[PDB]
C-alpha cells in the first residue's frame, strides 16, 4: 500500500552536486508529481527514509555510506535505494544492494567500475558516466582526424573522491576500446610546483591533442606556461575536461563567458593563451521543462531546505535524480500492471533499461547497460571578443556531433593541427 | 563474565593461509591455553561467533566480509574481531571496526594502506606486512651497494586479491621512503605471451637488480628466457618475491630444495638459469614451540576440522593468529588488572603496541604502529649441488642481516654485480 525509498546521500554537506540540500527538493518535486498522476502508483503513499553518506568530518565516506545502507535496510526494508553520488561511497553500497536484490538509482557514481553491472546488478545510473565521455572524445577524434595519439593530464586533491582520476579512467578505457590509439596519461598534484616543469615538458613530448582534468586555476596556469613556452593553437590543442563547467558562469545570465578573466593583470596574457584551449562540458538541457524545474527547485530548496540553489551545470544531477525517480515509479507501475510486485527488482530494472524517457532534462535514454546516455557540449572562444561559447554538441544516444548556432571550431591554422608532429616528436 | 570474539575469515574455502580449516584449530589451541592459564582472564569463558568472508563463489569478498562483520556486531556485540586476511575483505571490515571502537586482530591484511592506523584504528597486525618487505630490501641494498636502481616485475590473476600488487606496493613505497633510489615497476599477465618479449626487453633496459613477484612457473619461464637471451649472474640478479615459498617444499623434510626441477627435460637448462636467481621468503620459526604447535595444529585440524594441514611457510599465518590472540588476552587481563574493561579498545590496543612477546612463532615484536616486525630469509643455490638453501636471514626488529650456517651469497663474479651497467643502460 506504500513504497519505502531509502536515500544515502550527503544530508548535511551542501557542496556536492548530489547533496540532499539540492537533491532533496528535486525528489520532493518528483514525489509530488507522482501524487498528481493517477497513472503512476495510484493509491500508494511513497515514503522516504534518509541516511547520510558523510562521515564525522562531513565528506562522503567509504564507511559512513555503507553503514547507513545496512541501517536503512534492516530498519525499513526499502524497495529502492537513492544515491550515493560519490564513487567510493556508491561502490560498497552498490555491492550491498546488489546482494540484497534491491534496485539502486543514482545520478552519480560515474566511475568505470560501476558500469560492470554483472557486479553492480540492479544499479541504474540516470546521470553522467565517464565512459560516455570516452564516447564523445571518440566521436571528436573521428570527426577531426586525430587517430594516433593523445596526452591526458589529470590531478586530484588528496583524500577527495578522485573525480579527475575516474573521469580520466573512463575516457581512457572507452577511447582505447573504440579507437585503439595511443593515450598517454600523467597524474600531477595541483599545489606542487615541481610538477609544472614536468607537465610542460610532457606536453611538448607526449602529445599534441591534449586533455587536462584539473581546477580552472590549474588549467589557466598551465595555459599561461604553454604560451610562455611557445605552444600555440597552430600545433597544440588543449581540452579542459570541466564537465560541470566550474571554469564558466551559468547559462542563464552573466553574458558573456570568460574563463581566462581573473583580475590579476595576467588576463591579457591568458586570453592569448586560451586561443589554443577548448572546454568540454556536459550539455545544458534546452527544454522549457528544465527551466521550470529550476524555478521550482530553487523555490522548494529555499523553503523546506534553507538552501539557495544557484544556476549551473551541477543542477542536472538533481534534475536526473528527479527524472530517475519518475522513471522508476512508472516501471513499478508497469510491473504492478502485469502482476508483479514492487520487489521484482529484475523486472523493474529491465523495464527501465534500454528505454527512452521524457523528463525535466528532456529526452533521456537509458542504454542496454542501465546507464543514461550523456550529451556533451564543446566550448570555444570567439577570436573577436575572446568570450567562449558552445560551438559543438554531442547527442549521446545518436553519437552525432552537431554544429551549434552556425559556429565554427576556431583554429589558428584554419584546420585542426595533427595529433602527431612533422618528423616525429623528436 | 565472558568474552565474545567475532571471527570473519573463509569458513569454507580451505585455500587461504588464513582459512578457518587452518586458523580455527590454531585459535582453539590458543583458547585452550587461556583456560590452562590462571594468569590469563581467570573465570572468563571466551566465546567465539563466526562469519564467513567468502561470497557465493567461495572466494574472499569485499562484500560478504563487511556484511558478516555488521551481522556479528549487532547480533553478539563482540569485544574483538579476528580476521579477515584478504586485503579487499579486511579494508571495509577494518574501517567498520575502527568506527565501532572495537579492536581488530589479523595475521593477514598485509597491504600498505592498512598501515595507516589513523584510519584503521585499533587494527593490530600480528602476521607479515608488505612494508616490512621494503625494510628487508632496504637492508639488502645497503649491505650490497645497490644504491641506484631496481626493477620490479609483478603479475596477478584477474579477480584475486592482487597479492603481488600489494607486495610490490609495500616494497616500492617503503624502499623509496628509505633509500630514494629509482624503483622501476612493470605489471604483466602470466598467461599472456605478448608480455614476455616486453618483460625481457624491460629486464635488459630498466634494471640489473630485478625483483619478480609471480607464480613459480612464471618465474622459472622468465629465468629460462633470460638464460636463452644471455642474462647471467655476472650482470643480473633475479629475486623471486615468493614470501610463502610456493616455489619450495617444506622445511621439515623433502631434502634437498630444487625449484628449477620440473620434469619437462628443461630441468638441466633451468638449473643453469637459476644460478642468477635468489628466492626471498618469510623466515621459518626456529623455536621448538613452533614445531610442537605444528603437531597439535595438525592433530586438531584433522580432528575437529576434517582438514589436513601440510607443512609450509603458510602455517605461520595460523601460528600468528594463535600468538596474537594470546597477546590480546594478556592485554585484556592487564587492562582488567587496572580497573579497565574489555571494551577499552584504546587501552587494550596500546598495551599490545610497541611490545615484545613470546609465542609459538618465538620472539615476536609489535612495532609502534601495531604491526608485527617480519623476519625474512634469503635462499641461494649451492653451485655444487644446485639445491637452494637459506644463506641470509633478516631480523625485522633489529633490521640486521645474519649469515646462515656460514654460507656465502653465490655470485658468478665473486661479488654482486652493480645495480647500474658499464656506460649506462644503453
Amino acid at each position: 500500500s506504500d513504497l519505502t525509498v531509502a536515500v544515502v546521500l550527503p544530508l548535511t554537506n551542501t557542496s556536492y552536486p548530489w547533496s540532499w540540500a539540492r537533491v532533496g527538493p528535486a525528489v520532493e518535486l518528483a514525489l509530488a508529481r507522482v501524487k498528481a498522476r493517477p497513472d503512476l502508483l495510484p493509491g500508494w503513499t511513497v515514503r522516504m527514509v534518509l541516511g547520510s553518506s558523510e562521515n564525522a568530518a562531513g565528506v562522503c565516506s567509504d564507511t559512513a555510506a555503507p553503514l547507513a545502507a545496512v541501517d536503512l535496510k534492516w530498519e525499513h526494508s526499502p524497495a529502492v535505494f537513492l544515491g550515493p553520488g560519490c564513487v567510493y561511497s556508491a561502490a560498497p553500497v552498490g555491492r550491498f544492494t546488489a546482494h540484497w536484490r534491491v534496485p539502486l538509482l543514482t545520478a552519480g557514481a560515474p566511475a568505470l567500475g560501476i558500469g560492470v553491472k554483472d557486479e553492480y546488478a540492479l544499479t541504474t545510473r540516470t546521470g553522467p558516466s565517464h565512459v560516455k565521455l570516452g564516447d564523445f572524445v571518440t566521436a571528436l577524434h573521428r570527426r577531426l582526424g586525430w587517430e594516433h595519439q593523445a596526452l591526458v593530464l589529470y590531478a586530484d586533491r588528496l583524500g577527495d573522491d578522485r573525480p579527475c582520476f575516474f573521469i580520466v579512467e573512463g575516457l581512457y578505457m572507452r577511447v582505447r576500446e573504440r579507437l585503439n590509439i595511443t593515450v598517454n596519461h600523467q597524474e600531477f598534484v595541483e599545489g606542487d610546483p615541481d610538477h609544472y616543469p614536468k607537465l610542460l615538458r610532457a606536453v611538448r613530448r607526449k602529445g599534441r591533442v591534449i586533455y587536462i582534468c584539473s581546477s580552472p586555476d590549474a588549467f589557466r596556469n598551465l595555459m599561461l606556461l604553454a604560451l610562455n613556452a611557445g605552444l600555440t593553437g597552430e600545433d597544440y590543442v588543449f581540452f579542459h575536461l570541466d564537465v560541470f563547467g566550474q571554469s564558466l558562469k551559468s547559462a542563464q545570465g552573466l553574458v558573456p563567458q570568460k574563463p581566462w578573466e581573473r583580475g590579476d593583470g595576467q588576463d591579457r596574457s591568458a586570453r592569448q593563451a586560451f586561443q589554443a584551449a577548448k572546454i568540454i562540458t556536459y550539455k545544458e538541457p534546452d527544454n522549457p521543462e528544465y527551466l521550470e524545474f529550476l524555478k521550482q527547485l530553487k523555490l522548494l530548496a529555499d523553503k523546506k531546505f534553507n538552501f539557495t540553489v544557484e544556476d549551473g551545470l551541477k543542477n542536472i544531477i538533481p534534475a536526473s535524480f528527479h527524472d530517475g525517480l519518475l522513471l522508476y515509479v512508472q516501471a513499478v507501475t508497469e510491473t504492478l500492471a502485469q502482476g508483479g510486485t514492487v520487489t521484482d527488482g529484475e523486472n523493474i530494472t529491465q523495464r527501465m533499461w534500454n528505454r527512452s524517457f521524457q523528463g525535466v532534462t528532456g529526452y533521456l535514454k537509458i542504454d542496454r547497460n542501465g546507464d543514461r546516455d550523456t550529451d556533451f557540449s564543446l566550448w570555444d572562444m570567439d577570436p573577436e571578443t575572446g568570450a567562449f561559447r558552445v560551438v559543438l554538441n554531442y547527442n549521446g544516444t545518436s553519437q552525432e556531433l552537431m554544429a551549434v548556432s552556425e559556429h565554427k571550431l576556431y583554429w589558428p591554422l584554419g584546420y585542426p593541427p595533427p595529433d602527431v608532429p612533422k618528423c616525429g616528436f623528436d | 563474565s565472558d568474552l565474545t570474539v567475532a571471527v570473519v575469515l573463509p569458513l569454507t574455502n580451505t585455500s587461504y593461509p588464513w582459512s578457518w580449516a587452518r586458523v580455527g584449530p590454531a585459535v582453539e589451541l590458543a583458547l585452550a591455553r587461556v583456560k590452562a592459564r590462571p594468569d590469563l582472564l581467570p573465570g572468563w569463558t571466551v566465546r567465539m561467533v563466526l562469519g564467513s568472508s567468502e561470497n557465493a563463489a567461495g572466494v574472499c569478498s569485499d562484500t560478504a566480509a563487511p556484511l558478516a562483520a555488521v551481522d556479528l556486531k549487532w547480533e553478539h556485540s563482540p569485544a574483538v574481531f579476528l580476521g579477515p586476511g584478504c586485503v579487499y575483505s579486511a579494508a571495509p571490515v577494518g574501517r567498520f571496526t575502527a568506527h565501532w571502537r572495537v579492536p581488530l586482530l589479523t595475521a593477514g591484511a598485509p597491504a600498505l594502506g592498512i598501515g595507516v592506523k589513523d584510519e584503521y584504528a585499533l587494527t593490530t597486525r600480528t602476521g607479515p606486512s608488505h612494508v616490512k618487505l621494503g625494510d628487508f630490501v632496504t637492508a639488502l641494498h645497503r649491505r650490497l651497494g645497490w644504491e641506484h636502481q631496481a626493477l620490479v616485475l609483478y603479475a596477478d590473476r584477474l579477480g584475486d586479491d592482487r597479492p603481488c600488487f600489494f607486495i610490490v606496493e609495500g616494497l616500492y613505497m617503503r624502499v623509496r621512503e628509505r633509500l630514494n633510489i629509482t624503483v622501476n615497476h612493470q605489471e604483466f599477465v602470466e598467461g599472456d605471451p605478448d608480455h614476455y618479449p616486453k618483460l625481457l626487453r624491460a629486464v635488459r633496459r630498466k634494471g640489473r637488480v630485478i625483483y619478480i613477484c609471480s607464480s613459480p612457473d612464471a618465474f622459472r619461464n622468465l629465468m629460462l628466457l633470460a638464460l636463452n637471451a644471455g642474462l647471467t649472474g655476472e650482470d643480473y640478479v633475479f629475486f623471486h618475491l615468493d614470501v610463502f615459498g610456493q616455489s619450495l617444499k617444506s622445511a621439515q623434510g623433502l631434502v634437498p630444495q630444487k625449484p628449477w626441477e620440473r620434469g619437462d627435460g628443461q630441468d638441466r637448462s633451468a638449473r643453469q638459469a637459476f644460478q642468477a636467481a635468489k628466492i626471498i621468503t618469510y623466515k621459518e620459526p626456529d623455536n621448538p614451540e613452533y614445531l610442537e604447535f605444528l603437531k597439535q595444529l595438525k592433530l586438531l585440524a584433522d580432528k575437529k576440522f576434517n582438514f589436513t594441514v601440510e607443512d609450509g611457510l603458510k602455517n605461520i599465518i595460523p601460528a600468528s593468529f594463535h600468538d596474537g590472540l594470546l597477546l590480546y588476552v594478556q592485554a585484556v587481563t592487564e587492562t582488567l588488572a587496572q580497573g579497565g574493561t574489555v571494551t577499552d579498545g584504546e587501552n587494550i590496543t596500546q598495551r599490545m603496541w610497541n611490545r615484545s612477546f613470546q609465542g609459538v612463532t618465538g620472539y615476536l615484536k609489535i612495532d609502534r604502529n601495531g604491526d608485527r616486525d617480519t623476519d625474512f630469509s634469503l635462499w641461494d643455490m649451492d653451485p655444487e649441488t644446485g639445491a637452494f638453501r637459506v644463506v641470509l636471514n633478516y631480523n625485522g626488529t633489529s633490521q640486521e642481516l645474519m649469515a646462515v650456517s656460514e654460507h656465502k651469497l653465490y655470485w658468478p663474479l665473486g661479488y654482486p654485480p652493480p645495480d647500474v651497467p658499464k656506460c649506462g643502460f644503453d
Binding site: 564513487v87 614536468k198 | 600498505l112 616500492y172
Partner: peptide, 22 residues
C-alpha cells in the same frame, strides 16, 4: 593503472600509473 576496483586501499601508490606524486 585503470580498472582496478573502487577501494581507497588500491589507491595508496598508483604503482601501475604514471604519477609525479607518491
Amino acid at each position: 593503472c585503470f580498472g582496478g576496483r573502487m577501494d581507497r586501499i588500491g589507491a595508496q601508490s598508483g604503482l601501475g600509473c604514471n604519477s609525479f606524486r607518491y
